[PDB]
Design a binder for this molecule. Structure first.
Ligand code: PRO
Ligand code: PRO
Ligand SMILES: [Cl-]
Lengths: 258, 251
């Protein structure tokens, strides 16, 4: 009874707080989605042809005036939005526009990248990618992407605004459940996006972690009682339908029972 | 009772953060528009609506209007995107070619920006009679070819749009939030939006009782039902959230 009341208070309180964090994250990504849709309708982008630089080999192809103008468009958007890591556009001929610009990039084909394949599978809709690694700058990124028509074909290319796991950690690290509790963020597939207490877990699979975290992977929703990191914890698994991610609120049982 | 204050505050804190992220997106797009070559490079050739009939539309006016229309199209929560200049000329979407007797320089969003040069800021809520709309602007005064500052960029959101956002926010199991300016002007009452842009103390019933509390708990009867309220100031938005939960639910 008293145990039940303390437990239901945690589940109720943490769920009510997490649902507002879910809403916050959705508004953040809504703004990104809307800016991808703005870029996708822009005349330099919707009207793109075969004259953008191609970085598939050792040296980029020659830079056209249209490439310069599209690069500057993306640069100006990125300047106004410091939470964006990259703004880019990959085309079906392998050409690419990117900010921060890298005139020296080599051996890069956007068409083989996971964000590009995801957009093509969802053509005409603006969606988010699974988290993926970008080796060149040692970065784990989540893309907001849209495959669009242009002069090369329909679909002709994919617009992409990238955010780093660092931006997600900013929103998540704020939440304190009591004095010991915290919030984890995972993809449905089990990939950890944010562990604010043990960031070494970032971009690893929940079902492959030690210390009891693998048992969290079995729960789709609601309360879990479990031992974690050598201590008794309670967890509240909160799925975000719209983000396609799961929040997990974690707290020491010691704190709940006091 | 004291648990309600602590519990509702934890929820409203994250609502505050959510609303900040919404407005942060608008601030950043104002800053984008501010640096655009059609805008930062604007001169003396935009349409002037101060008389009974607008002046003739130039090519630069056409291109700036199309820029704003494209931004607005991608952002449905934006009610207007506009730009007023120190010579009284004006660019706006949705475009109104028939507008008359309009000078942007006398308007509250414009004067607020000029009073905060160097910053992108929000206006107090203000009335736009031509569409019977109440709007909160995000503005920035900027240099252009006419002067430094030479004009003001403005993205407007209406109280109807804010009400759509706030309506969806739950508090506790059945509670809800009001959004208030510090001077008592209601921004959002999601249950009775006829209260929007009225003064709390003039709404009678229990609402006047909320009008005298700057922060913390209020126990009151709202529309014949006993309610508990937590008045929560937002430092960053400069508004108060009022979290309301029926006292039956609290106990
Ligand atoms: O990973 C990729 O393919 C792109 C390139 C810049 C960062 N994101
Ligand atoms: O009220 C004003 O002055 C501007 C005009 C469009 C709506 N906001
Ligand atoms: Cl309105």
């Amino acid at each position: 009874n008293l145990r039940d009341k303390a437990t239901s208070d945690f589940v109720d309180s943490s769920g009510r707080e997490i649902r507002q964090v879910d809403n916050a994250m959705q508004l953040f990504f809504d703004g990104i989605t809307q800016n991808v849709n703005y870029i996708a309708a822009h005349p330099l982008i919707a009207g793109a042809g075969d004259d953008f630089r191609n970085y598939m080999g050792a040296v980029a192809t020659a830079q056209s005036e249209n490439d310069k103008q599209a690069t500057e468009l993306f640069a100006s958007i990125a300047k106004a939005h410091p939470a964006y890591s990259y703004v880019s556009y990959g085309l079906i001929n392998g050409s690419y526009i990117m900010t921060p610009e890298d005139p020296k990039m080599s051996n890069y084909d956007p068409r083989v990248r996971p964000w590009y394949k995801t957009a093509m599978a969802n053509a005409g809709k603006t969606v988010r990618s699974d988290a993926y690694y970008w080796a060149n700058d040692d970065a784990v990124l989540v893309s907001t992407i849209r495959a669009i028509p242009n002069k090369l074909g329909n679909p002709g290319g994919v617009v992409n605004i990238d955010v780093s796991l660092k931006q997600l950690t900013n929103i998540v690290k704020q939440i304190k459940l009591g004095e010991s509790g915290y919030l984890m963020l995972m993809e449905k597939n089990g990939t950890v996006l944010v562990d604010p207490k043990q960031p070494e877990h970032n971009f690893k699979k929940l079902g492959e972690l030690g210390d009891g975290f693998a048992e969290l992977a079995k729960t789709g929703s609601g309360l879990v009682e479990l031992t974690l990191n050598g201590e008794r914890y309670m967890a509240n698994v909160y799925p975000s339908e719209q983000l396609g991610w799961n929040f997990i609120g974690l707290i020491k049982q010691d704190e709940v029972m006091a």
